[PDB]
Structure 1
Amino acid sequence: MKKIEAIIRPFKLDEVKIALVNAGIVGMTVSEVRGFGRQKGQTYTVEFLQKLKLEIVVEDAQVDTVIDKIVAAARTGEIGDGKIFVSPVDQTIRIRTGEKNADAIS
């Protein structure tokens, strides 16, 4: 299991969501963040820009799927399109039922 964290432009949320659900990736967590990349917030002094952070936990088999769909959906081709961080998840538990791992993600 992996966690996928993607920072994207806020207006791209809808397209990203649709692309993931259509590919059978259903379950994600969204929050509001500010940030900068290599260009230090310049569309020198350094600025933070509004972004959205998507968090998506899946089975290792699905990681490349999640990455492609976000990239396809979030790319405009201008600087500040986002960045994606894949990190390990040791264990997932659904709270309602107590199911673990594969059963908690499907």
Structure 2
Amino acid sequence: HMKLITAIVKPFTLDDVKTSLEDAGVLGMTVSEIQGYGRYSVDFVPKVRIEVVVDDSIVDKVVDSIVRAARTGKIGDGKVWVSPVDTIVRVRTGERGHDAL
């Protein structure tokens, strides 16, 4: 029942995407910079990777909020994918599953 959402997006949409997440009810995420090749050398372009672990009930809304705030209309807007998570543990407590988010 847990899922990982990975978003590759333009760095200047990060603020939009972040509020789009908090409206959806995602209460935190992890961000890193990436170098993206698509349609380092000149062909590489900076992007940000946003990863949020969520419940699977809430994944379509989250994916679409991300899509919604990351949309420019120009090439290189990126992608959002989802992949399974077996378990998640909060380090501080030992809470597992939804209680770990």
- 4+ runs of 1 displaced by more than 3 Å? none
| Bigger strand fraction | 2
Alignment equivalent of 2:50, drawn from 46, 54, 57: 54
Secondary structure of the 1:97 match is: coil
1:16 Cα deviation after fit: 0.2
What is the aligned partner in structure 1 of residue 17 from structure 2?
Answer: 16
What is the aligned partner in structure 2 of residue 25 from structure 1?
Answer: 26
The percent identity for this pair of structures is 58
What is the aligned partner in structure 1 of residue 88 from structure 2?
Answer: 92
Q: How many residues are paired up? A: 99
Residue 8 of structure 1 aligns with an amino acid whose one-letter code is V
Residue 69 of structure 1 aligns with an amino acid whose one-letter code is S
User: What is the alpha-carbon distance in structure 2 between the residues aligned to residue 11 and residue 20 of structure 1?
Assistant: 15
1:27 Cα deviation after fit: 1.5
Q: Which structure 1 residue ranges, 5 or more long, are not aligned?
A: 40-44
Residue 81 of structure 1 aligns with an amino acid whose one-letter code is D
User: What is the alpha-carbon distance in structure 2 between the residues aligned to residue 26 and residue 62 of structure 1?
Assistant: 12
User: What is the alpha-carbon distance in structure 2 between the residues aligned to residue 17 and residue 68 of structure 1?
Assistant: 13
Secondary structure of the 1:61 match is: coil
